[PDB]
Amino acid sequence: DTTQQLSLLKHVLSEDKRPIAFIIAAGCPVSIRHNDAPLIPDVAGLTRKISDSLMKIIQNLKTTIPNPTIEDILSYIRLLQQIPMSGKIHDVENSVINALEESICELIEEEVNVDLPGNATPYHKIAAWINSINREHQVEIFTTNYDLLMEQALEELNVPYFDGFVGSKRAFFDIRTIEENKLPSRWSKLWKLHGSINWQLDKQTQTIWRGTPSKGCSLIHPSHLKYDQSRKMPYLVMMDQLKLFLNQPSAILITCGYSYKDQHINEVLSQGLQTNPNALIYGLQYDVLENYQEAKDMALKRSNLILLAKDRAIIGKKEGGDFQHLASFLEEISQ
Amino acid sequence: SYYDTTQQLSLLKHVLSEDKRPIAFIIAAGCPVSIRHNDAPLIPDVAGLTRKISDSFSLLMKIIQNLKTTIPNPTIEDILSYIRLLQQIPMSGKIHDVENSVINALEESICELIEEEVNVDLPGNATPYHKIAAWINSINREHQVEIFTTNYDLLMEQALEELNVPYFDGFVGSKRAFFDIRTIEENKLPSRWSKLWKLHGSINWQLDKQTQTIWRGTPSKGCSLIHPSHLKYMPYLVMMDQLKLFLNQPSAILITCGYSYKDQHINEVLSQGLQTNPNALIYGLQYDVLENYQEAKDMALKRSNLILLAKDRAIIGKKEGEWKLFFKLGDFQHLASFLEEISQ
Amino acid sequence: DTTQQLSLLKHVLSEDKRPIAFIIAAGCPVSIRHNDAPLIPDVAGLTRKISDSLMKIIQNLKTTIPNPTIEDILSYIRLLQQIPMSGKIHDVENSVINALEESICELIEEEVNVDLPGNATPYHKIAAWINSINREHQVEIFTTNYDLLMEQALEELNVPYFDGFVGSKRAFFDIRTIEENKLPSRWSKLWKLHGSINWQLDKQTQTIWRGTPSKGCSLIHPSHLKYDQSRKMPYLVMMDQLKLFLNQPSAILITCGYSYKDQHINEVLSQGLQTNPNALIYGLQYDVLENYQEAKDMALKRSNLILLAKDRAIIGKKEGEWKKLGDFQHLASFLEEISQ
Amino acid sequence: EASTYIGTVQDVNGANIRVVLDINTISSLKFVDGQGYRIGQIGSFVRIPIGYINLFGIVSQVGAGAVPDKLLEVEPYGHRWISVQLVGEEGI
Amino acid sequence: TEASTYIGTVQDVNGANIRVVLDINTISSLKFVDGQGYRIGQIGSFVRIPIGYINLFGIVSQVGAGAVPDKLLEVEPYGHRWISVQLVGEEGI
């Protein structure tokens, strides 16, 4: 039963000489409790908070789409923004779009600007477990959150991490550091797929410099124009780094809180699983196993895919979650 | 201040006679214009296509005036990009105040008209394309000759088939011909095999269902991915990367014919490649007066390893000068004849 | 015992070393059932489909030939149309032989134009296994069928393959690149001996180009004039590639559904087996062992050939006995199990 | 390396330099801002910059006649050496 | 590969005294060109050296161990496949 793959995961963690990593979704911080309340609101909570603060566009989008998320709303707003005379599509006087997007950005900015709690955070336990292993294979972690909680957790233990950016209040984006990929093994690497409120673009050119959070402008969900010969706002570089990590010798990788609701991530995951035969994904499911149809389909299609849920477990394409629990298990295995 | 045609012709003849140094080409819309089957050329130019679309089709003409406010005289690419942007927005029919689905009908109509106009066969074995194909087979070079095209027709493909010229355009398969992307970067292709890249697409491109996998084959009715770049979230990016990577090869040479340098992305890529590699050389060949090409003259003044050839003007090594009209090599047929004479 | 044979086959095929190749006959479409019916029936199905679609030629050949097939009929029609005044056998004013030739050719092309079903196709399993091995010795596939099913499934699996034709809708017949063999290792070779349903000849010369299926016209069972050579080659060069694979150090070969009813194939396989003793063949039979007298004779003659059937297992030119792999879906399942 | 670059000095005998042509062979054109000059011709001049001032010289021998002794014994199939004779120099 | 009327490649230049190494594999006798029988490099015969667009002509002056360069004899004393060609004129455009 459960003891089988528990011992299996303990053994593969004890199996060195192979790279390890993790995927952080919005569920892990949401399940973290601060003052008996979630530290970070969920996607539904974020949408409700946004609605708390011009629903014609939402109603129009609801005709062809079910209950949307913040990403779809902001993408639609920007898409109307590029169109010059897009105001006539929804009422008139296309100036409410800029004010609405600025207000939404501000609301998100002070919504996600939350300091990490004390030493009881399991992020500290994860960082300690990672640092306690002296394996040559460095760990590169990709997250989807719009905050910098993991940055604070890693910086609280003096753990070396690199996010692709270096410098000062106007730190630039070093492009070829990923190219030659020549870094000491002691260092670790970090990537934010959708970014945080830290990154901000520049008026003169698309530089997306990192630094002190500027007033008014923030970069989130990179989907802007890519006609500037890359280096504009590249999530493609993160995707390429993920593909390279899938192209190295096969290793079993895990994930935390992933809902398998990202088509871009799902496509590259399927491509990596097809290219690397022994590649294994240890994505769990802290919910009903029937609530993840995409995960079940991926497990059925890819034999090497491993899926575990609260009510069932899909192992070997045949059917059969807490971040704190995983952190405690890792800490116990480390000792 | 005065340049000699014969010196440049001899230089080019010596250059083409080499074998190891990599060679490439760019075929623009001005190349098929120089070949005529009827009284008019077998394929019209960009301006001819725009005029045909304009007079073949007050609400329709609003879009042309709407784009002209922030841009010069619109072309086919601008119109297609605007239609794509309109289809991106669901309720975008209020801008034109014509329902919300006539845009799709107009897109289908213009795509069908373009496919009908472009699906032509080149007549006769004396076409310059056949001469170029024969020239490619003449010398068994150490490095194969690559070809880049920004056209929409399949004249180059048919010419290559006619003279038994193996090639590889990034597509493998007999029925569906799926896009293989790992073999492109792996690049362990046969030495004799050439390559051909269509930067703006052609009539044989069709888009699949929600799978969105791209494939090539027999063109279908009401479907043509002749979009120059369109939009995405892609073959175009890897083709641009292939061009840039080729431009970085040692002592690489790239030849342009019939290209007016009107584009911006291509000029930026060429400038970046020229700045990065100090040994690359580009032969800018024109068939008009150089005063018409502001971007080309700006780039020739900025860069030192760029050579321009026009009817009555030439810029060599950041020093604009005058010929000793002249430079009959600007025409595509004359270039093919020169290549055939060099091979023979 | 059967188990020892299966284990040996698993540990000789699953091991990466000698090159791998398969032969696929017309029996493979029989083993796949769509809507409780086979996707494409056996040769006899096509024959009596044509029959129910002018028996005079049939009984004329029946006098000296047993129960015939379509290939014999079309070859006889071609031999007739070589002769200018060939109507003396059948009436006058020659139009029937032609009209029969077209009627049957587009009838066959309409009968064969079938789309593959969903992801449960065994071809998908074979393609996945092919993608699961990255050995230097690539896998070349020989087929006697006419459909596009195998390459359709392979393209649906996103894998490269070279079939001797390069180009576009008017792709010609590449000839030299066949035998410089300067191709990437990851690439695989696909050869169809009896032809496809899209190949079309040309009026100017024998071009046998491959591309968009020509309206009505198609090339099936190449048997026309071969005096010119070079042009209209694929048949001869297909047998040549088969012979070269039969020779050279290659301790692996798999058969599936072959009925051993081809004289031009039996002779060349016997010659290759005699010339190459180190190589081995694992010919199977989805029937009783007694239905293949030619296969039994070949097994008795050449010891290198291994013949297995439902009735028994002929090993080392000697008849054996039992005390599952005939099913092609079972073969795909076994391949998937070996790969996994 | 920058343009207008030929090779590297590998010998000195007072007033007879022996120079090695580099590996990027077969080119034999070496285009420099338009017109290209054939590499290592008999009558051509060369320039050797030392810090701030330049040294000029005239080619005298090209091929197997310029290569030193031991290299021919090491490999007789390689003749990519030229013999430059000094003429003058350009001051500040 | 190499076209007809091929003899060798230049391996030494001394202003107006070219040295050529014969690249013919063997059978230095009657290299047929255009149905006419010409002989491989001989004392009284001419050679042609094409440079891009103009052809330099020359006349053979020495064949054998005399034409071998200075230290090539020192490296090996049994190799003699060189000829000494002296330039005469050129053909323009």
PDB file of C-alpha atoms in Angstrom, chain A residues 41-225:
ATOM      1  CA  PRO A  41      -5.214  33.776  -1.181  1.00  0.00           C
ATOM      2  CA  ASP A  42      -6.066  31.107  -3.725  1.00  0.00           C
ATOM      3  CA  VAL A  43      -6.941  31.811  -7.356  1.00  0.00           C
ATOM      4  CA  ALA A  44     -10.651  31.931  -6.503  1.00  0.00           C
ATOM      5  CA  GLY A  45      -9.907  34.160  -3.518  1.00  0.00           C
ATOM      6  CA  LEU A  46      -7.741  36.440  -5.653  1.00  0.00           C
ATOM      7  CA  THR A  47     -10.490  36.730  -8.274  1.00  0.00           C
ATOM      8  CA  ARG A  48     -13.069  37.490  -5.573  1.00  0.00           C
ATOM      9  CA  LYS A  49     -10.809  40.165  -4.075  1.00  0.00           C
ATOM     10  CA  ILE A  50     -10.294  41.704  -7.524  1.00  0.00           C
ATOM     11  CA  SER A  51     -14.057  41.699  -8.110  1.00  0.00           C
ATOM     12  CA  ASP A  52     -14.476  43.409  -4.729  1.00  0.00           C
ATOM     13  CA  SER A  53     -12.704  46.437  -6.220  1.00  0.00           C
ATOM     14  CA  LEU A  54     -16.907  47.577 -15.134  1.00  0.00           C
ATOM     15  CA  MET A  55     -18.001  43.935 -15.286  1.00  0.00           C
ATOM     16  CA  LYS A  56     -19.025  44.318 -18.947  1.00  0.00           C
ATOM     17  CA  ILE A  57     -15.735  42.794 -20.117  1.00  0.00           C
ATOM     18  CA  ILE A  58     -16.114  39.962 -17.595  1.00  0.00           C
ATOM     19  CA  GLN A  59     -19.643  39.254 -18.842  1.00  0.00           C
ATOM     20  CA  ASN A  60     -18.493  39.330 -22.475  1.00  0.00           C
ATOM     21  CA  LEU A  61     -15.666  36.899 -21.695  1.00  0.00           C
ATOM     22  CA  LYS A  62     -18.086  34.674 -19.762  1.00  0.00           C
ATOM     23  CA  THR A  63     -20.035  34.014 -22.977  1.00  0.00           C
ATOM     24  CA  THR A  64     -17.282  31.786 -24.401  1.00  0.00           C
ATOM     25  CA  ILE A  65     -15.307  31.045 -21.206  1.00  0.00           C
ATOM     26  CA  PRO A  66     -16.360  29.726 -17.762  1.00  0.00           C
ATOM     27  CA  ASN A  67     -15.545  31.525 -14.480  1.00  0.00           C
ATOM     28  CA  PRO A  68     -12.184  33.070 -15.415  1.00  0.00           C
ATOM     29  CA  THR A  69      -9.029  33.887 -13.460  1.00  0.00           C
ATOM     30  CA  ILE A  70      -6.926  37.016 -13.005  1.00  0.00           C
ATOM     31  CA  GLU A  71      -4.510  35.997 -15.771  1.00  0.00           C
ATOM     32  CA  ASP A  72      -7.258  35.823 -18.401  1.00  0.00           C
ATOM     33  CA  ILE A  73      -8.678  39.192 -17.324  1.00  0.00           C
ATOM     34  CA  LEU A  74      -5.307  40.947 -17.462  1.00  0.00           C
ATOM     35  CA  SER A  75      -4.456  39.319 -20.801  1.00  0.00           C
ATOM     36  CA  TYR A  76      -7.770  40.507 -22.254  1.00  0.00           C
ATOM     37  CA  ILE A  77      -7.199  44.020 -20.886  1.00  0.00           C
ATOM     38  CA  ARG A  78      -3.739  44.163 -22.461  1.00  0.00           C
ATOM     39  CA  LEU A  79      -5.062  42.749 -25.747  1.00  0.00           C
ATOM     40  CA  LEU A  80      -7.599  45.572 -25.852  1.00  0.00           C
ATOM     41  CA  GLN A  81      -4.760  47.954 -24.963  1.00  0.00           C
ATOM     42  CA  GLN A  82      -2.671  47.123 -28.041  1.00  0.00           C
ATOM     43  CA  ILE A  83      -5.702  47.786 -30.258  1.00  0.00           C
ATOM     44  CA  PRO A  84      -5.840  51.606 -30.566  1.00  0.00           C
ATOM     45  CA  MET A  85      -9.590  52.037 -31.117  1.00  0.00           C
ATOM     46  CA  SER A  86     -10.619  49.155 -28.859  1.00  0.00           C
ATOM     47  CA  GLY A  87     -12.826  51.352 -26.671  1.00  0.00           C
ATOM     48  CA  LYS A  88     -15.675  51.201 -29.180  1.00  0.00           C
ATOM     49  CA  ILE A  89     -15.756  47.421 -28.666  1.00  0.00           C
ATOM     50  CA  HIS A  90     -16.754  47.896 -25.003  1.00  0.00           C
ATOM     51  CA  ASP A  91     -18.578  51.227 -24.583  1.00  0.00           C
ATOM     52  CA  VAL A  92     -16.434  54.267 -25.450  1.00  0.00           C
ATOM     53  CA  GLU A  93     -13.570  56.462 -24.183  1.00  0.00           C
ATOM     54  CA  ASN A  94     -10.794  53.871 -23.950  1.00  0.00           C
ATOM     55  CA  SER A  95      -9.129  55.485 -20.949  1.00  0.00           C
ATOM     56  CA  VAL A  96     -10.773  53.331 -18.266  1.00  0.00           C
ATOM     57  CA  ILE A  97      -8.563  50.442 -19.419  1.00  0.00           C
ATOM     58  CA  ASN A  98      -5.326  52.089 -18.266  1.00  0.00           C
ATOM     59  CA  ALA A  99      -6.783  53.156 -14.916  1.00  0.00           C
ATOM     60  CA  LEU A 100      -8.302  49.704 -14.395  1.00  0.00           C
ATOM     61  CA  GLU A 101      -5.038  47.895 -15.122  1.00  0.00           C
ATOM     62  CA  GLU A 102      -3.081  50.294 -12.901  1.00  0.00           C
ATOM     63  CA  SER A 103      -5.553  49.757 -10.051  1.00  0.00           C
ATOM     64  CA  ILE A 104      -5.449  45.975 -10.531  1.00  0.00           C
ATOM     65  CA  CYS A 105      -1.650  46.039 -10.478  1.00  0.00           C
ATOM     66  CA  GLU A 106      -1.625  48.144  -7.313  1.00  0.00           C
ATOM     67  CA  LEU A 107      -4.153  45.866  -5.624  1.00  0.00           C
ATOM     68  CA  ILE A 108      -2.080  42.792  -6.483  1.00  0.00           C
ATOM     69  CA  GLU A 109       1.076  44.611  -5.356  1.00  0.00           C
ATOM     70  CA  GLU A 110      -0.134  45.209  -1.811  1.00  0.00           C
ATOM     71  CA  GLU A 111      -1.973  41.867  -1.819  1.00  0.00           C
ATOM     72  CA  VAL A 112       1.171  39.779  -2.395  1.00  0.00           C
ATOM     73  CA  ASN A 113       3.538  42.038  -0.402  1.00  0.00           C
ATOM     74  CA  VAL A 114       3.411  39.779   2.655  1.00  0.00           C
ATOM     75  CA  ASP A 115       6.425  39.073   4.850  1.00  0.00           C
ATOM     76  CA  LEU A 116       7.301  35.474   5.640  1.00  0.00           C
ATOM     77  CA  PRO A 117       6.544  34.284   9.200  1.00  0.00           C
ATOM     78  CA  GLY A 118       9.096  33.054  11.734  1.00  0.00           C
ATOM     79  CA  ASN A 119      11.183  29.874  11.847  1.00  0.00           C
ATOM     80  CA  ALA A 120       8.037  27.694  11.864  1.00  0.00           C
ATOM     81  CA  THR A 121       7.678  28.047   8.083  1.00  0.00           C
ATOM     82  CA  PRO A 122       8.260  24.714   6.282  1.00  0.00           C
ATOM     83  CA  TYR A 123      10.166  26.691   3.635  1.00  0.00           C
ATOM     84  CA  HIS A 124      13.009  26.972   6.151  1.00  0.00           C
ATOM     85  CA  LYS A 125      12.872  23.205   6.694  1.00  0.00           C
ATOM     86  CA  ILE A 126      13.048  22.619   2.931  1.00  0.00           C
ATOM     87  CA  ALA A 127      16.023  24.974   2.632  1.00  0.00           C
ATOM     88  CA  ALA A 128      17.796  23.245   5.526  1.00  0.00           C
ATOM     89  CA  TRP A 129      17.168  19.824   3.977  1.00  0.00           C
ATOM     90  CA  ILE A 130      18.523  21.032   0.626  1.00  0.00           C
ATOM     91  CA  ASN A 131      21.625  22.574   2.207  1.00  0.00           C
ATOM     92  CA  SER A 132      22.250  19.483   4.363  1.00  0.00           C
ATOM     93  CA  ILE A 133      22.971  17.454   1.194  1.00  0.00           C
ATOM     94  CA  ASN A 134      26.439  17.916  -0.319  1.00  0.00           C
ATOM     95  CA  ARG A 135      25.590  16.263  -3.644  1.00  0.00           C
ATOM     96  CA  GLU A 136      27.283  17.721  -6.712  1.00  0.00           C
ATOM     97  CA  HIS A 137      23.916  17.918  -8.507  1.00  0.00           C
ATOM     98  CA  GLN A 138      22.535  21.385  -7.801  1.00  0.00           C
ATOM     99  CA  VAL A 139      18.799  21.906  -7.306  1.00  0.00           C
ATOM    100  CA  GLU A 140      16.928  24.351  -9.550  1.00  0.00           C
ATOM    101  CA  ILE A 141      13.406  25.214  -8.385  1.00  0.00           C
ATOM    102  CA  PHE A 142      10.717  26.760 -10.593  1.00  0.00           C
ATOM    103  CA  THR A 143       7.688  28.417  -8.997  1.00  0.00           C
ATOM    104  CA  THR A 144       4.442  30.025 -10.136  1.00  0.00           C
ATOM    105  CA  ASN A 145       3.785  32.382  -7.212  1.00  0.00           C
ATOM    106  CA  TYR A 146       3.868  36.160  -7.619  1.00  0.00           C
ATOM    107  CA  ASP A 147       5.543  36.734  -4.233  1.00  0.00           C
ATOM    108  CA  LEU A 148       9.133  36.362  -2.992  1.00  0.00           C
ATOM    109  CA  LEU A 149       8.491  34.188   0.064  1.00  0.00           C
ATOM    110  CA  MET A 150      10.941  31.510  -1.078  1.00  0.00           C
ATOM    111  CA  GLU A 151      13.575  34.193  -1.690  1.00  0.00           C
ATOM    112  CA  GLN A 152      13.221  35.364   1.916  1.00  0.00           C
ATOM    113  CA  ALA A 153      13.328  31.769   3.168  1.00  0.00           C
ATOM    114  CA  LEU A 154      16.495  30.969   1.205  1.00  0.00           C
ATOM    115  CA  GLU A 155      18.179  34.243   2.190  1.00  0.00           C
ATOM    116  CA  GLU A 156      17.376  33.613   5.870  1.00  0.00           C
ATOM    117  CA  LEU A 157      19.752  30.614   5.984  1.00  0.00           C
ATOM    118  CA  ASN A 158      22.576  32.062   3.826  1.00  0.00           C
ATOM    119  CA  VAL A 159      21.893  29.602   1.006  1.00  0.00           C
ATOM    120  CA  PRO A 160      23.301  30.534  -2.434  1.00  0.00           C
ATOM    121  CA  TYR A 161      20.564  31.088  -5.009  1.00  0.00           C
ATOM    122  CA  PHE A 162      20.552  32.663  -8.468  1.00  0.00           C
ATOM    123  CA  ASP A 163      17.405  33.912 -10.211  1.00  0.00           C
ATOM    124  CA  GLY A 164      18.997  34.880 -13.528  1.00  0.00           C
ATOM    125  CA  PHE A 165      19.458  38.484 -12.364  1.00  0.00           C
ATOM    126  CA  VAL A 166      22.368  40.223 -10.645  1.00  0.00           C
ATOM    127  CA  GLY A 167      23.326  43.775  -9.775  1.00  0.00           C
ATOM    128  CA  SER A 168      21.672  46.555  -7.791  1.00  0.00           C
ATOM    129  CA  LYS A 169      18.473  48.630  -7.743  1.00  0.00           C
ATOM    130  CA  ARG A 170      18.815  48.581 -11.548  1.00  0.00           C
ATOM    131  CA  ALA A 171      20.022  44.987 -11.905  1.00  0.00           C
ATOM    132  CA  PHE A 172      19.954  43.739 -15.496  1.00  0.00           C
ATOM    133  CA  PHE A 173      19.215  40.321 -17.023  1.00  0.00           C
ATOM    134  CA  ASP A 174      22.395  38.346 -17.677  1.00  0.00           C
ATOM    135  CA  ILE A 175      21.472  36.297 -20.744  1.00  0.00           C
ATOM    136  CA  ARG A 176      24.418  33.967 -21.388  1.00  0.00           C
ATOM    137  CA  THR A 177      24.727  32.735 -17.790  1.00  0.00           C
ATOM    138  CA  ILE A 178      22.078  30.229 -18.862  1.00  0.00           C
ATOM    139  CA  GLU A 179      23.948  29.741 -22.152  1.00  0.00           C
ATOM    140  CA  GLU A 180      27.286  28.423 -20.912  1.00  0.00           C
ATOM    141  CA  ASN A 181      25.677  27.300 -17.613  1.00  0.00           C
ATOM    142  CA  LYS A 182      29.047  27.560 -15.834  1.00  0.00           C
ATOM    143  CA  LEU A 183      28.324  27.996 -12.126  1.00  0.00           C
ATOM    144  CA  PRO A 184      29.776  26.397  -8.982  1.00  0.00           C
ATOM    145  CA  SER A 185      27.974  23.282  -7.791  1.00  0.00           C
ATOM    146  CA  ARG A 186      27.438  24.795  -4.330  1.00  0.00           C
ATOM    147  CA  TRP A 187      25.164  27.476  -5.796  1.00  0.00           C
ATOM    148  CA  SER A 188      21.479  26.916  -6.540  1.00  0.00           C
ATOM    149  CA  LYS A 189      19.239  28.312  -9.268  1.00  0.00           C
ATOM    150  CA  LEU A 190      15.724  29.764  -9.152  1.00  0.00           C
ATOM    151  CA  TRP A 191      13.222  30.703 -11.857  1.00  0.00           C
ATOM    152  CA  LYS A 192       9.815  32.391 -11.660  1.00  0.00           C
ATOM    153  CA  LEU A 193       7.613  31.319 -14.569  1.00  0.00           C
ATOM    154  CA  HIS A 194       5.058  34.128 -14.215  1.00  0.00           C
ATOM    155  CA  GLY A 195       7.243  36.482 -12.167  1.00  0.00           C
ATOM    156  CA  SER A 196       6.674  38.594  -9.071  1.00  0.00           C
ATOM    157  CA  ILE A 197       6.019  42.288  -8.425  1.00  0.00           C
ATOM    158  CA  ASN A 198       9.794  42.787  -8.312  1.00  0.00           C
ATOM    159  CA  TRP A 199      10.426  42.784 -12.071  1.00  0.00           C
ATOM    160  CA  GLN A 200       9.584  45.993 -13.930  1.00  0.00           C
ATOM    161  CA  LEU A 201      10.084  46.959 -17.562  1.00  0.00           C
ATOM    162  CA  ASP A 202      11.677  50.111 -18.983  1.00  0.00           C
ATOM    163  CA  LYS A 203      10.220  52.790 -21.234  1.00  0.00           C
ATOM    164  CA  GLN A 204      13.219  53.186 -23.554  1.00  0.00           C
ATOM    165  CA  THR A 205      13.568  49.453 -24.227  1.00  0.00           C
ATOM    166  CA  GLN A 206      12.259  46.113 -22.987  1.00  0.00           C
ATOM    167  CA  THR A 207      14.877  45.433 -20.306  1.00  0.00           C
ATOM    168  CA  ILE A 208      12.679  43.996 -17.479  1.00  0.00           C
ATOM    169  CA  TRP A 209      15.344  44.993 -14.959  1.00  0.00           C
ATOM    170  CA  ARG A 210      15.089  43.561 -11.447  1.00  0.00           C
ATOM    171  CA  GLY A 211      15.520  45.726  -8.370  1.00  0.00           C
ATOM    172  CA  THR A 212      13.641  47.707  -5.748  1.00  0.00           C
ATOM    173  CA  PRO A 213       9.882  47.512  -6.501  1.00  0.00           C
ATOM    174  CA  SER A 214       9.095  50.607  -8.542  1.00  0.00           C
ATOM    175  CA  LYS A 215       5.941  52.606  -7.876  1.00  0.00           C
ATOM    176  CA  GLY A 216       3.207  51.894 -10.432  1.00  0.00           C
ATOM    177  CA  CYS A 217       4.826  49.420 -12.839  1.00  0.00           C
ATOM    178  CA  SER A 218       5.157  45.680 -12.250  1.00  0.00           C
ATOM    179  CA  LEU A 219       5.756  42.704 -14.538  1.00  0.00           C
ATOM    180  CA  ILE A 220       3.504  39.654 -14.160  1.00  0.00           C
ATOM    181  CA  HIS A 221       2.430  36.785 -16.444  1.00  0.00           C
ATOM    182  CA  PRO A 222       4.893  37.409 -19.307  1.00  0.00           C
ATOM    183  CA  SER A 223       2.917  37.432 -22.558  1.00  0.00           C
ATOM    184  CA  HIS A 224       3.995  40.721 -24.168  1.00  0.00           C
ATOM    185  CA  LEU A 225       5.396  41.244 -27.666  1.00  0.00           C
TER     186      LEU A 225
END
